[PDB]
Design a protein around this ligand. Structure first.
Ligand SMILES: CC(C)/C=C(\Oc1cccc(C(=O)O)c1O)C(=O)O
Length: 416
């Protein structure tokens, strides 16, 4: 490591995002910026890439692709490969698709071939930005020069945003909600989350947009990425899993949102069910006795925090797998909710309702639930937002709730 104190009057998110823009202009490299506990970590460059797909795992280093057959749990396959990366570097970063959480409910055979489950990479360089300092790991000369240039000029002003209409319902979200409700009435499941996609008809600047949104959102984690043809940014509302080096496993389910919240029976029940659900799953991977709800049904939303100690027969990937996908983005019971999503949502979800991850050689894992994000693939730019569906839900109300959820990003999109 090296370091260079943070200039006063400069916000770490803005600076980290600018650095992402700057390094991109000069070196034209892939990156992932992850915000975690006051540290904005820019993982710059891909030294080695792990691609996990439904049919194959690939490790790509220096343009050389090494393909792998895998069977069993996706977590084991991802885990084995990632552990290898972590022999050479301290951290690895990436995203996990929603579809990583399909084998667990037996739904894998429904995936098309070459369906992406995770992309995890070890970076060439790491730059960490906190209010206190800027830390450099394995920064070469262009990277050093790039930081210097940024520090020398300081951040660009964010241009004004360009609006998008989210009123159109091309995917029949209203119709699909109606269908889900009938099934719920019919006892197929209690809850399911469904979503819609709102195309953005103009290109956006991802780093400038991420900065604008960040000012106006307060998330558990945030991310900006340019990774393998995918561009994305997001302020994750929820922590799916964290594993500490000492083996403490944390998960933080949230079933609150829109006093009345703390007393509302519907919200209370919905929450209690997730907490109980998280506990059971965490129980699968936990040292016997260790699992506890340390904060319960506290309003933050309504959130609880569940703790456990990872069992020695178990590992970080298995813990993520056990907790995947999050209830908040699937439904109850989880197997039925997931199956319903396959039928009733536009798949494959990919990054939506998945996780963005940071892993460490010390056994660390940090996984954040991906909602409130924007994406660019191909020439396609879009947003995705969803709602929880229960027997009582009405489609028009649900449509507006997605609208509300999309207003986290809609006012803040900078073009280019
Ligand atoms: C913290 C978080 C889990 C709580 C909420 O947020 C969401 C839940 C499900 C889908 C989305 C979405 O944006 O598509 C979402 O934002 C909530 O409204 O309950």
């Amino acid at each position: 490591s090296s370091s260079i104190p943070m200039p006063a009057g400069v916000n770490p998110a803005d600076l980290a995002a600018e650095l992402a823009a700057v390094v991109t202009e000069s070196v034209d490299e892939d990156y992932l910026l992850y915000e975690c506990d006051g540290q904005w970590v820019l993982a710059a460059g891909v030294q080695a890439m792990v691609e996990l797909d439904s049919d194959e795992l690939r490790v790509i280093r220096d343009g050389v692709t090494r393909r792998q057959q895998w069977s069993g749990r996706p977590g084991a396959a991802l885990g084995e490969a990632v552990d290898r990366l972590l022999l050479e570097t301290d951290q690895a970063f990436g995203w996990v698709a929603f579809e990583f959480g399909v084998h667990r409910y037996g739904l894998q055979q429904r995936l098309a071939p070459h369906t992406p489950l995770a992309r995890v990479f070890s970076p060439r360089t790491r730059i960490m930005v906190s209010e206190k300092e800027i830390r450099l790991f394995d920064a070469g000369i262009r990277h050093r020069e790039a930081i210097d240039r940024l520090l020398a000029t300081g951040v660009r002003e964010v241009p004004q945003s360009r609006s998008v209409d989210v009123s159109d319902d091309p995917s029949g979200f209203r119709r699909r909600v109606a269908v889900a409700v009938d099934e719920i009435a019919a006892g197929r499941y209690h809850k399911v989350i469904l979503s819609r996609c709102v195309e953005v008809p103009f290109a956006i600047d991802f780093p400038l947009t991420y900065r604008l949104g960040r000012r106006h959102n307060t998330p558990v984690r945030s991310f900006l990425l340019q990774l393998g043809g995918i561009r994305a940014l997001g302020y994750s509302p929820e922590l799916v899993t964290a594993v500490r080096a000492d083996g403490v496993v944390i998960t933080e389910p949230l079933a609150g949102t829109r006093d009345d919240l703390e007393s509302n029976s519907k919200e209370i029940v919905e929450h209690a069910i997730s907490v109980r659900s998280s506990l059971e799953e965490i129980t699968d991977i936990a040292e016997p006795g260790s699992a506890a709800v340390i904060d319960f049904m506290t309003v933050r939303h309504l959130g609880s925090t569940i703790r456990a100690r990872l069992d020695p027969s178990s590992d970080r990937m298995a813990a993520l797998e056990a907790l995947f996908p999050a209830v908040t983005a699937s439904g109850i019971p989880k197997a039925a909710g997931v199956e319903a999503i396959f039928r009733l949502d536009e798949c494959p979800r990919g990054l939506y309702s998945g996780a963005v991850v940071m892993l460490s050689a010390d056994g660390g894992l940090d996984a954040a639930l991906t909602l409130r994000a924007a994406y660019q693939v191909g020439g396609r730019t879009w947003l995705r937002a969803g709602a929880g569906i229960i027997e009582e839900s009405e489609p028009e109300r649900e449509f507006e709730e997605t609208c509300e959820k999309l207003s986290t990003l809609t006012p803040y999109l900078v073009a280019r």
